[PDB]
Design an enzyme around this catalytic site. Structure first.
Site, PDB file in Angstrom:
ATOM      1  N   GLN B  12      39.376  40.086  40.351  1.00 38.43           N
ATOM      2  CA  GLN B  12      40.257  38.996  40.751  1.00 38.43           C
ATOM      3  C   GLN B  12      41.042  38.437  39.594  1.00 38.43           C
ATOM      4  O   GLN B  12      42.271  38.355  39.654  1.00 38.43           O
ATOM      5  CB  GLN B  12      39.458  37.898  41.438  1.00 38.43           C
ATOM      6  N   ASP B  34      38.360  49.400  33.361  1.00 43.87           N
ATOM      7  CA  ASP B  34      37.408  49.000  34.377  1.00 43.87           C
ATOM      8  C   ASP B  34      36.525  50.181  34.683  1.00 43.87           C
ATOM      9  O   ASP B  34      36.874  51.324  34.387  1.00 43.87           O
ATOM     10  CB  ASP B  34      38.149  48.539  35.628  1.00 43.87           C
ATOM     11  N   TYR B 143      22.792  34.658  37.832  1.00 49.06           N
ATOM     12  CA  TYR B 143      24.149  34.683  37.241  1.00 49.06           C
ATOM     13  C   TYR B 143      24.348  33.528  36.268  1.00 49.06           C
ATOM     14  O   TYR B 143      24.660  33.734  35.093  1.00 49.06           O
ATOM     15  CB  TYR B 143      25.145  34.601  38.359  1.00 49.06           C
TER      16      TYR B 143
HETATM   17  N1  NAD Z   1      36.691  34.342  40.105  1.00 50.89           N
HETATM   18  C1  NAD Z   1      36.098  33.188  39.822  1.00 50.89           C
HETATM   19  O1  NAD Z   1      36.131  32.191  40.567  1.00 50.89           O
HETATM   20  C2  NAD Z   1      35.319  33.052  38.540  1.00 50.89           C
HETATM   21  C3  NAD Z   1      34.811  31.795  38.274  1.00 50.89           C
HETATM   22  C4  NAD Z   1      34.103  31.604  37.131  1.00 50.89           C
HETATM   23  C5  NAD Z   1      33.885  32.631  36.243  1.00 50.89           C
HETATM   24  N2  NAD Z   1      34.369  33.850  36.496  1.00 50.89           N
HETATM   25  C6  NAD Z   1      34.120  34.907  35.505  1.00 50.89           C
HETATM   26  O2  NAD Z   1      35.316  35.668  35.283  1.00 50.89           O
HETATM   27  C7  NAD Z   1      34.985  37.042  35.070  1.00 50.89           C
HETATM   28  C8  NAD Z   1      35.747  37.917  36.043  1.00 50.89           C
HETATM   29  O3  NAD Z   1      35.487  37.430  37.341  1.00 50.89           O
HETATM   30  P1  NAD Z   1      36.292  38.080  38.606  1.00 50.89           P
HETATM   31  O4  NAD Z   1      36.268  37.012  39.650  1.00 50.89           O
HETATM   32  O5  NAD Z   1      37.554  38.755  38.222  1.00 50.89           O
HETATM   33  O6  NAD Z   1      35.189  39.148  39.038  1.00 50.89           O
HETATM   34  P2  NAD Z   1      35.438  40.399  40.002  1.00 50.89           P
HETATM   35  O7  NAD Z   1      34.113  40.824  40.570  1.00 50.89           O
HETATM   36  O8  NAD Z   1      36.647  40.090  40.853  1.00 50.89           O
HETATM   37  O9  NAD Z   1      35.855  41.566  39.003  1.00 50.89           O
HETATM   38  C9  NAD Z   1      34.910  42.110  38.100  1.00 50.89           C
HETATM   39  C10 NAD Z   1      35.468  43.465  37.725  1.00 50.89           C
HETATM   40  O10 NAD Z   1      34.557  43.932  36.753  1.00 50.89           O
HETATM   41  C11 NAD Z   1      34.305  45.309  37.008  1.00 50.89           C
HETATM   42  N3  NAD Z   1      33.038  45.826  36.473  1.00 50.89           N
HETATM   43  C12 NAD Z   1      31.797  45.685  37.000  1.00 50.89           C
HETATM   44  N4  NAD Z   1      30.911  46.327  36.256  1.00 50.89           N
HETATM   45  C13 NAD Z   1      31.561  46.851  35.227  1.00 50.89           C
HETATM   46  C14 NAD Z   1      31.190  47.702  34.100  1.00 50.89           C
HETATM   47  N5  NAD Z   1      29.908  48.036  33.947  1.00 50.89           N
HETATM   48  N6  NAD Z   1      32.125  48.059  33.223  1.00 50.89           N
HETATM   49  C15 NAD Z   1      33.416  47.697  33.377  1.00 50.89           C
HETATM   50  N7  NAD Z   1      33.858  46.992  34.436  1.00 50.89           N
HETATM   51  C16 NAD Z   1      32.971  46.534  35.366  1.00 50.89           C
HETATM   52  C17 NAD Z   1      34.430  45.477  38.541  1.00 50.89           C
HETATM   53  O11 NAD Z   1      34.782  46.805  38.915  1.00 50.89           O
HETATM   54  C18 NAD Z   1      35.569  44.497  38.841  1.00 50.89           C
HETATM   55  O12 NAD Z   1      36.863  45.150  38.750  1.00 50.89           O
HETATM   56  C19 NAD Z   1      33.469  37.137  35.158  1.00 50.89           C
HETATM   57  O13 NAD Z   1      32.836  37.021  33.872  1.00 50.89           O
HETATM   58  C20 NAD Z   1      33.099  35.927  35.996  1.00 50.89           C
HETATM   59  O14 NAD Z   1      31.744  35.509  35.860  1.00 50.89           O
HETATM   60  C21 NAD Z   1      35.082  34.092  37.645  1.00 50.89           C
END
Ligand code: NAD
Ligand code: NAD
Ligand code: NA
Ligand code: NA
Lengths: 320, 320
Positions: B12, B34, B143
């Site tokens: 995202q 990714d 988490y």
């Molecule tokens: N979206 C939110 O509301 C939100 C809020 C707070 C924190 N975060 C943090 O932001 C970061 C990204 O969140 P997001 O919402 O984009 O998550 P997401 O799940 O949308 O995307 C995560 C991506 O990481 C990839 N991934 C998973 N395992 C992997 C690996 N071993 N090697 C490489 N890539 C891998 C997945 O394929 C996916 O494309 C995270 O650290 C999350 O904790 C997100």
């Protein structure tokens, strides 16, 4: 009556704890394990119910749990405050991974699991006089960081799966039997050996740097007591406990009162100092006193008298 | 111009962040990766400098760093609040181990490294109204546990090795391009889909559960800004940032103003609720505002307007 597994059992805490558990519940009911074997001078050398286990081998760890069928476990391996700074990868491996395996086994096999935390989980935002059980945790060492993780992961296992996870934040622990494994409080045990050997103590902690400490018998008493407590009496998973606070210069005076002579100590800062300075001066352990009866029978001079007697006996040093 | 690596880039946040970095600094200065390949409709499909890398493969991770020589990295993979409770083994593997490898590569190759934390690092002792940067951290999800660990470990890397580690605790992030990955705040994006589809939204978060949230463009502005800041302006490594808080019922009202129709929403509690109820209602982000100028343009209705416009465009759903 419990079946008790102890991992990392041959270090400073494990040595005395293993013996106390064996004496209380019987040798047959206690299994002691470590990645190394007891040295021929070690107090557990020759004993039955002492095995080799690398806790990084989850499959091995599981195997041993499967045959012994413990109802309690004390998971003690960790790399500590000073040594962790020099070997951080090993610290991260052991303090994080072995803990994860141990919790997962406590879950799978329904084991009441103790994993000690430490005053090193605190940093300089903790509020440093009578530090509370719940405060800001900003540890300045990787060890401390891995222990904040251990407390949180353990508590999550309790919340999520009902794993009976119990923990105390241990202060600096003083004992005679097994030499310490590289924490910031190791000077205290070494000052007694220096005084018995009549040699210069080069103390790496500054003379007025006061820290929470505890003598081993009180530590063992509390380690057993928190594990025997009914789950319903425990209001939390992780408890501060302390014995009494002292600085090196206070330790020196104690020894001089008990030896009835001067001992020589040179205060030359080592890595232990900046680490210790980040920690509390004293802990509030009223939750532990109230929920499960934590108590302290030794003071500094009773400790000094016992240490000065026991070291020559256990390690063959000259005496008073 | 920085050379920017983004890991976990197809998710995202990574989707929009990768596009914004490429526009700001040039496609040739940005490499993103990714564990999976982009599908043909992903906005990063067909673009140069999009690589397949599993961050659990430390060799592979290092090889990519060594070839590209980033000066900045945004390390994004993690398993989030809700999905982590159902897959905790993966959460611990990904959130702890990829982060450890990331920090080591930032040390070894001199990278300014951003690893986001989250509001999920908080639990029910944090001080739920205008939560401070420094407070009790007692997360009730694995988490959240792993993220407290991420903040503290990164901070230790900064202190011990001078690694320029920077983090924000992100609120729920709202965006239109790539669907969310299993956080407790995911209902919100799905409610916009339900509205445009004119289908019933079954919402697992209760109607007055208010949470900190932010719209993507503000998030992107802050993610770049905190990384542009001079190190000496930063009084801390980890910052709260927020946009605005809302509950599902407030979100529903907002969508209804913009659509001029009723959405059907039924509240059937799911795992997201208990998780979200342990989180802050609102954050104090003054340290961020003061140190590096964190700022927010959107409010809930501007967000809703832009979401309802972009989702049809981006996903082919029926417009207004
Ligand atoms: N979206 C939110 O509301 C939100 C809020 C707070 C924190 N975060 C943090 O932001 C970061 C990204 O969140 P997001 O919402 O984009 O998550 P997401 O799940 O949308 O995307 C995560 C991506 O990481 C990839 N991934 C998973 N395992 C992997 C690996 N071993 N090697 C490489 N890539 C891998 C997945 O394929 C996916 O494309 C995270 O650290 C999350 O904790 C997100
Ligand atoms: N001694 C103190 O003052 C003190 C203070 C606070 C907390 N603690 C905690 O108490 C526990 C034990 O401390 P200690 O002073 O007994 O430490 P120690 O270094 O004396 O003993 C650690 C033992 O763990 C073993 N070990 C290391 N890696 C292992 C592995 N992979 N598998 C199995 N065993 C392994 C070592 O061989 C050693 O016998 C630790 O969790 C420590 O953080 C100790
Ligand atoms: Na002190
Ligand atoms: Na709330």
């Amino acid at each position: 009556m419990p079946r008790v597994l102890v991992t990392g059992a041959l270090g400073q805490i494990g040595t005395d704890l293993s013996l106390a558990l064996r004496d209380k519940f019987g040798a047959d009911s206690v299994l002691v394990s470590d990645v190394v074997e007891p040295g021929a001078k070690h107090p557990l050398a020759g004993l039955k119910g002492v095995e080799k286990l690398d806790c990084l081998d989850s499959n091995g760890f599981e195997k041993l749990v499967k045959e012994f069928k413990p109802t309690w476990m004390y998971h003690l391996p960790a790399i500590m405050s000073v040594r962790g700074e020099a070997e951080p990868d090993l610290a991260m491996d052991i303090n994080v991974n072995t803990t994860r395996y141990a919790l997962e086994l406590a879950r799978k096999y329904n084991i009441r699991i103790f994993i000690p935390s430490t005053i090193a989980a605190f940093g300089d935002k903790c509020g440093k006089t009578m530090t509370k059980d719940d405060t800001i945790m900003n540890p300045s060492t990787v060890y401390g960081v891995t222990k904040v993780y251990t407390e949180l992961l353990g508590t999550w296992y309790r919340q999520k799966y009902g794993v009976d996870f119990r923990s105390v934040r241990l202060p600096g622990i003083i004992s005679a039997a097994t030499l310490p494994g590289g924490g910031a409080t190791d000077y205290a045990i070494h000052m007694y050996h220096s005084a018995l050997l009549q040699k210069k103590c080069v103390c790496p902690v500054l003379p007025y740097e006061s820290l929470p400490m505890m003598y081993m018998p009180d530590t063992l008493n509390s380690l057993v007591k928190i594990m025997e407590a009914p789950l319903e009496k425990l209001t939390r998973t992780v408890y501060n406990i302390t014995g009494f606070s002292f600085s090196p210069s206070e330790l020196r005076f104690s020894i001089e009162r008990c030896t009835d002579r001067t001992i020589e100590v040179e205060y030359v800062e080592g890595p232990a100092q900046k680490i210790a300075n980040s920690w509390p001066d004293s802990l509030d352990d009223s939750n532990a006193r109230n929920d499960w009866g934590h108590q302290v029978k030794y003071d500094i001079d009773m400790m000094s008298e016992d240490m000065l007697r026991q070291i020559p006996i256990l390690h063959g040093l000259p005496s008073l």
